[PDB]
Subunit: 112 residues, 4 copies
């Protein structure tokens, strides 16, 4: 009954980054889910929960490039697809991993 959620904040406008594509995939595998964030910069239903979530490593592809493109950040952006690898150990624990994003930097952390 574990859960994996996320959250994106656009540190340039100080508002949640919405409609940003998020790819999720098991380590080694290829995309298994592809979600687009809502206005609060989240996804209605967790990226993982219950049976789905299983100890091991995962990666999330935040499509920062396209996000900033829709706002402006160039024709060959420094940050294209911000990738994040991590390992969920406890299959029943909750994992909130937000992404603080800027055109030239980002914060990856385990919130709650």
């Amino acid at each position: 009954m574990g859960k994996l959620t996320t959250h994106i904040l656009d540190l340039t406008c100080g508002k949640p980054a919405a409609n940003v594509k998020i790819g999720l995939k098991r380590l080694g595998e290829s995309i298994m889910k592809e979600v687009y964030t809502n206005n609060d910069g989240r996804v209605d239903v967790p990226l993982l929960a219950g049976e789905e979530l299983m100890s091991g490593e995962y990666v999330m592809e935040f499509h920062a490039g396209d996000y900033f493109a829709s706002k402006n950040a160039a024709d060959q952006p420094f940050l294209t697809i911000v990738t994040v690898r991590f390992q969920l150990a406890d299959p029943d624990a909750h994992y909130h991993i937000p992404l603080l994003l800027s055109p030239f930097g980002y914060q990856v952390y385990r919130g709650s």
Copy 2:
């Protein structure tokens, strides 16, 4: 004559993270270089420079898991191999991309 350098800071001890393995690879490809940081938490010679550096996307595998392991952060660490994707547009420009690291979060940015 461009250049790509990096730098790792252990925000838990407030000291540069040394002997942390860093894998570098072109987007799509597999490891092409594998360096271990010195005491200042850097690498004597840039990861890329001159001819080697060529516009396109690259990924860096910082081996955070093992680093914290040598200090402590568990038997199945949240952060195992912190991965970073980015795109170098100008083949002649300099790119300093440090990694501020913590057992549960990290900052990726374009310094100088």
Copy 3:
């Protein structure tokens, strides 16, 4: 009917930082409130809301020093009282300003 909330994450343990003292004060003035965070690393009731909240600058004194002291980070900590100044412009808007904390660094941002 605006609101000002906060939130503290201990990036070293990956858990919310609780019972951390938080001083709040108007720019120029002295402490006007002093709260201690609960287990989720928040405060039951916002630091400001409704009439109380008024456009202008404010400062928050997060007592990081004592927090890490209760866990370990030294006898003369680098970070003692992490201070944060900011300006609430719209008296009716919501302001969630979390603090990502580490013994040697911290992230201050406007979440939501």
Copy 4:
């Protein structure tokens, strides 16, 4: 023979933030120095060094508000004067405390 240096990176343009005013002051006291960063986003001569530097707490007033104003971030900016308190324990040690800055967030850390 200790030293205290700083450094500012504009995470929005990915370039060092220059000509940003930096106030320095002992805990309790008022401004004792006021420097403006050069193009590399640093100051030619350290904010403190040798005899000047003495164990105790200090605060730095980065004038983020005006910086972003010269680029754009509003008529009543969220971040006006980003303030940073810290404590230098060893009078002979070096302290590099960079500031990663964004219009709605910032990273404060002990680099090297």
